[PDB]
């Protein structure tokens, strides 16, 4: 079974976006009005699932082939790669990274998406993978397109890919959004502006990575993720 | 002071979280192995129960696009981390409320007792993470049981909540669904009866 | 018939790209080694075709509908619009503006394009439009994608749209490439770098124009073109 | 000094200029009205001629992807700017060399004499603009006719070319292609016999 | 046998010196006029020799003793050491480092050097060494002196040592020149000025390293070399 | 974008390259083990062949201070990387042209066929890297054989060179030197008949 | 991105807004021509109705100093934009709640149906802008009618509101004041039963 042998650095709730950010309108009714109750870390918060033996399909990390309907998706072919480390710089191996995104037109494959950009018959939009020994993951996919949503009368989300990272404990699990280097929609989006510090915003911007590109084939972007620092317990209970 | 690398900031899971994380629930084809809501196969030790609940925003309206992650000890109070669709019991699971079903459900076993780090027993609990559109950073809460009033009164985590009435929002109501013992746990995100949420 | 009543400002040959720009490999064997011979403007160079009576199809400026064999193209729907003025700031009315581009995946609809990104069955990639009385033109199309090319071993063109503009005379006629705001491939392309002054590059950059977007539908880019200034002859032959 | 708005810089037409500018020649569907290589219909007044030529790069190899634009007076020496597919004669056309067709062709009428801005007659010529991959800003040139030797000798434009041998690079050679009077004009972008190109 | 399992980051041809740099006179007739043709990497370009089994003599890396006709060379006794890594910072072990240089007065031991500074009877001017498991190499030698040459009428090569490094493949192999910190001839040498960016020049300047010096015996310089980065293939041919 | 550490810049090998890399050629004493021009020993399998050539500059003059490194597969198509003077075949070697010897020679065996990354076979080739005074960064080229015309016509590398006449500069001419089978490979750095050089 | 000139920012209308915009109601002398609360003259076409309502703040107290502007189609579904005291019907008018009068009143006709931009018919509605002290930028809303249950179920604007309970705040209740058909529409600025407000 799991053993309580770690503590995780406390989160900075001023770096992460606050709960109530009124310009992202849906956060008004879904944010708590009472203060969070702080509790000490026990074995319930410092352990979590390990997905080493989950059986992955061969193309679970490859979105150009995982939804194959006899063709190749239309859109910019890219590899999205990166490394998952904790705040001390230590790689996080065999952790589960899950991602989902729109197609190249901004249309998502879900019953409730009625935007007019068409579905792509060869593109599903979901992928998953386990970080290797060194903390690296990689996915292949098509660059998603921006899309409008009913927030303000003319809001458009920037192209983004959603990520879900498990880490070693439930204290580390995190959902976020990856955005693309240079995209001018970024500073105008009320979701991205739910983050107050412009330096935290930068951490979500994936950079063009010509070094990992496959010449004559696909470009590559680099997104490194940092999970809460993990440390051994010391002097506890005496 | 010593600064370390800053954590990647959180963002909302957004409306279509079901697509990457609840495939069946997004009405999309599934892969062979999915992380879902059945933590205990029928031959697993313990008492089998059904958990169900709904989510409310601060106007009293249902949240039909939520996604919840759970984490619990088995009937002996042991957290089973090696996740595997062939174990009789897995400590982790996921569930969701959709437009079709406004209520999530989970099949598992009543968790046994674990101690806090100081060695004091915590009452049986389930650890919950809630994620949805409008929630910029996920909300942590714990579900306790109304049939464990003795142990709930001594829980060192429940006694950190100052006001007694606030402790009540974490206690799921035992009922019966199809002759199966079930507990209902509703989450109120905001307002009257607002569920207690934690930070750790 | 056309008359010699105009003169055009002399082109600044250090603002436009030179003929020999060796990083752009193909320019090497296709650039004159002798100097260009200057010749005074006559009626032969200061006049040119007027296309007012060319019969445009109804969909000629609309690339979401002018190819169409079933549906809509996959890609970010966008209006590219602007104004055509000469160097005195005077609108150029009734001029012809032709454009052509790749699909959302960087595949061009020509026999010789062998890149692996697929053709889009609903997308052709050509449009033409005549500017109005105020010098405005507009197209609706999908944002093209970058594509690789055999120049250096890992060269990728930035997403671009080619433009051809007639103007009032064969002296003002110009072929160019519109680029998109923020694309991080722009500073690495050897074709963009055929332009020596970084301020001349900036003029090829289309800006995101949220004001012209159609909400819940399509975004807009703004590209304005500046042709050689035109003036009446003065004090000639005395 | 007085600085005007700067002219939008030029870029190469690129390898696939045929998709936006010579549809047929790109072997793609055409629109109802296309600007092409037939400046004179059969009943246009004047001497009907066929023009043809090839384009060579600096190594001596054929340029198979060029696009060309011509501008010429009618037979009276008059520039007709009102472009229209119904006119028997247009002053403007376009033609291209392609993989299949290394040679371009133009169907037109031999132009009449036009004067320069000082009132001195120029010999009959066709104004050409050449575009193609590898050519960052198009190249301007003029096609003159070898049966107009006496007029060619006095043209004030051709007399601005300092060295007689370079003047020859502008003279198209009279020939017959299936009973029709034709003039061949090869452009040499670079090297031996480099075609004179102009700036104005 | 060698197997194709790596890719090397494409060379930045604007960082390295160009082929035609007319102040360096001999490059005028020895530089290609046609463009380099780009080819994808295969087993022919991504493999190369390995020199672990070559039989090094015991003083191969020690120029104070490897030539020796009855004494010691006259000149500033120095150690030149450093590390060979790739563009990722990964060390390059067991690689071949060759070097050759002039003597203290600038005379080189070759029939064709007719420079009036004498030959030193105890000095040869050649060394080789294989890097160690961490990528370190080291040689001991005397500091070369500058010499004049037939370029411009008063050109003088700054003191330098020629280096040649094999690395893991023919794609990585490189011949270069080390210069010494502070030498006022460095910015006036036309060969060093063939490198257009001043930042690339700094990479060839060895720095004085008092920490590695043997007190009362020899100074030391540090010279680190960086070869093309190497990565595993990913998503190729699908 | 992501910037890695920059590669150390290349500098010319210089007129005295022979002193550190071609000892005998510099006319200096050799060490016990030298990397030289005899890739194959008399008993190595495959067809034994002598290669030779001359190197020209852009004025048509011989380069007598050039240095060449070669890399080739053995007769069965395999790259032998462990270099060792006792092996029967080493895939690597070096040679040089000097004042004395205007011509380089290399004693090896005709390489077997290898595949590109895409599984397509290449024609038999020898990889060459050329260094000298006046060359700022070394030139890469490929030596192919004129008697392998069927494989050359299908090599996916030789077909990346656009113009056919440029492909011929890479095709070494079978001849006989002292009655022995030989292929002459002259390199032209600049000018008429300039040899194709690659970047990879 | 393209930035346009920015819009002159809004400021509250202040407590004494009646002095510039409701002179009667401010108890000050009127000018010959005033824009007021009688949209329909006795003989205008359509169904003559009286509209009345109160405005409440977040504590539940009457806002007695508000000002309201309205814009409605006439009885045939046409926007009468050419304001004139002599028209039988003006599509625009203004009213206000004061201390004497806690309730605003408006005399008009029940508007006909107009289509939205996509060609779909919207239900009969009156557009309202509300201003007052404490209101920094005016509030937009729409008055719909309870006897038009069918057209309201299909209104593409009322369907843009997610929560069915929130749509009801836009529906004026039919009643009678002195034999005359009347609708009552109360506006709740904040709080429980908070009126939906638009942005466009
Ligand atoms: Fe999203
Ligand atoms: Fe293009
Ligand atoms: Fe030297
Ligand atoms: Fe006031």
Short mmCIF file of N, CA, C and O in Angstrom, two decimals, chain A residues 81-86 89-95 97 129-138 222-225 227, chain E residues 88 90 232:
data_model
loop_
_atom_site.label_atom_id
_atom_site.label_comp_id
_atom_site.label_asym_id
_atom_site.label_seq_id
_atom_site.Cartn_x
_atom_site.Cartn_y
_atom_site.Cartn_z
N UNK A 81 5.98 18.51 -26.71
CA UNK A 81 6.80 17.73 -25.81
C UNK A 81 7.24 18.54 -24.59
O UNK A 81 7.30 19.75 -24.64
N UNK A 82 7.83 17.92 -23.62
CA UNK A 82 8.15 18.67 -22.49
C UNK A 82 8.54 17.77 -21.34
O UNK A 82 8.52 16.54 -21.54
N UNK A 83 8.71 18.36 -20.12
CA UNK A 83 9.24 17.56 -19.03
C UNK A 83 8.45 18.00 -17.83
O UNK A 83 8.10 19.18 -17.70
N UNK A 84 8.08 17.04 -17.00
CA UNK A 84 7.35 17.32 -15.83
C UNK A 84 8.33 17.27 -14.69
O UNK A 84 8.96 16.24 -14.56
N UNK A 85 8.63 18.38 -13.97
CA UNK A 85 9.54 18.38 -12.73
C UNK A 85 8.73 18.95 -11.52
O UNK A 85 7.59 19.47 -11.69
N UNK A 86 9.27 18.84 -10.29
CA UNK A 86 8.60 19.37 -9.13
C UNK A 86 9.33 20.74 -8.91
O UNK A 86 10.29 20.99 -9.60
N UNK A 89 13.07 20.97 -8.94
CA UNK A 89 13.83 20.62 -10.15
C UNK A 89 13.97 19.17 -10.43
O UNK A 89 14.62 18.71 -11.37
N UNK A 90 13.29 18.38 -9.64
CA UNK A 90 13.40 16.93 -9.70
C UNK A 90 12.33 16.40 -10.67
O UNK A 90 11.16 16.89 -10.67
N UNK A 91 12.72 15.58 -11.59
CA UNK A 91 11.77 15.03 -12.54
C UNK A 91 10.73 14.21 -11.88
O UNK A 91 10.98 13.53 -10.87
N UNK A 92 9.56 14.18 -12.52
CA UNK A 92 8.45 13.39 -12.03
C UNK A 92 8.30 12.25 -13.04
O UNK A 92 7.59 12.45 -13.99
N UNK A 93 8.83 11.03 -12.78
CA UNK A 93 8.72 9.88 -13.71
C UNK A 93 7.42 9.11 -13.58
O UNK A 93 6.81 9.14 -12.52
N UNK A 94 6.98 8.44 -14.66
CA UNK A 94 5.74 7.57 -14.69
C UNK A 94 4.55 8.22 -14.15
O UNK A 94 3.81 7.61 -13.46
N UNK A 95 4.30 9.45 -14.58
CA UNK A 95 3.11 10.17 -14.10
C UNK A 95 2.14 10.29 -15.25
O UNK A 95 2.57 10.37 -16.41
N UNK A 97 -0.08 12.06 -17.91
CA UNK A 97 -0.35 13.34 -18.51
C UNK A 97 -1.55 13.03 -19.53
O UNK A 97 -1.42 12.25 -20.49
N UNK A 129 -0.52 9.91 -21.87
CA UNK A 129 0.76 9.27 -21.90
C UNK A 129 1.39 9.29 -20.55
O UNK A 129 1.14 10.24 -19.69
N UNK A 130 2.39 8.50 -20.37
CA UNK A 130 3.04 8.42 -19.14
C UNK A 130 4.43 8.98 -19.32
O UNK A 130 5.09 8.76 -20.28
N UNK A 131 4.85 9.82 -18.43
CA UNK A 131 6.21 10.39 -18.49
C UNK A 131 7.21 9.26 -18.30
O UNK A 131 6.94 8.28 -17.67
N UNK A 132 8.34 9.36 -19.00
CA UNK A 132 9.38 8.34 -18.89
C UNK A 132 10.19 8.55 -17.63
O UNK A 132 9.87 9.44 -16.84
N UNK A 133 11.30 7.84 -17.52
CA UNK A 133 12.16 7.92 -16.34
C UNK A 133 12.69 9.24 -15.99
O UNK A 133 13.15 9.47 -14.89
N UNK A 134 12.85 10.00 -17.04
CA UNK A 134 13.35 11.27 -16.84
C UNK A 134 12.33 12.32 -16.72
O UNK A 134 12.74 13.46 -16.78
N UNK A 135 11.03 12.01 -16.72
CA UNK A 135 10.08 13.07 -16.60
C UNK A 135 9.56 13.62 -17.95
O UNK A 135 8.85 14.64 -17.85
N UNK A 136 9.98 13.14 -19.15
CA UNK A 136 9.53 13.59 -20.49
C UNK A 136 8.27 12.94 -21.05
O UNK A 136 8.03 11.73 -20.78
N UNK A 137 7.47 13.71 -21.74
CA UNK A 137 6.33 13.15 -22.43
C UNK A 137 6.35 13.69 -23.82
O UNK A 137 6.96 14.78 -24.07
N UNK A 138 5.62 13.05 -24.71
CA UNK A 138 5.40 13.75 -25.99
C UNK A 138 4.15 13.33 -26.64
O UNK A 138 3.56 12.35 -26.25
N UNK A 222 7.33 23.26 -27.04
CA UNK A 222 7.91 22.73 -25.83
C UNK A 222 7.11 23.30 -24.66
O UNK A 222 7.01 24.49 -24.43
N UNK A 223 6.59 22.40 -23.84
CA UNK A 223 5.88 22.87 -22.67
C UNK A 223 6.39 22.04 -21.42
O UNK A 223 6.14 20.85 -21.31
N UNK A 224 7.06 22.69 -20.49
CA UNK A 224 7.54 22.01 -19.30
C UNK A 224 6.54 22.28 -18.21
O UNK A 224 6.06 23.41 -18.10
N UNK A 225 6.21 21.32 -17.38
CA UNK A 225 5.25 21.63 -16.35
C UNK A 225 6.00 21.48 -14.99
O UNK A 225 6.93 20.62 -14.95
N UNK A 227 5.28 20.73 -10.94
CA UNK A 227 4.35 20.32 -9.89
C UNK A 227 4.98 20.74 -8.55
O UNK A 227 6.20 21.11 -8.49
N UNK E 88 22.64 20.23 -26.13
CA UNK E 88 21.79 19.97 -24.97
C UNK E 88 22.61 20.04 -23.64
O UNK E 88 21.99 19.99 -22.62
N UNK E 90 24.94 17.79 -22.97
CA UNK E 90 25.24 16.41 -22.67
C UNK E 90 26.74 16.18 -22.98
O UNK E 90 27.28 16.66 -23.98
N UNK E 232 17.24 11.50 -30.05
CA UNK E 232 16.68 10.21 -30.57
C UNK E 232 15.63 10.57 -31.67
O UNK E 232 14.96 11.67 -31.67
#
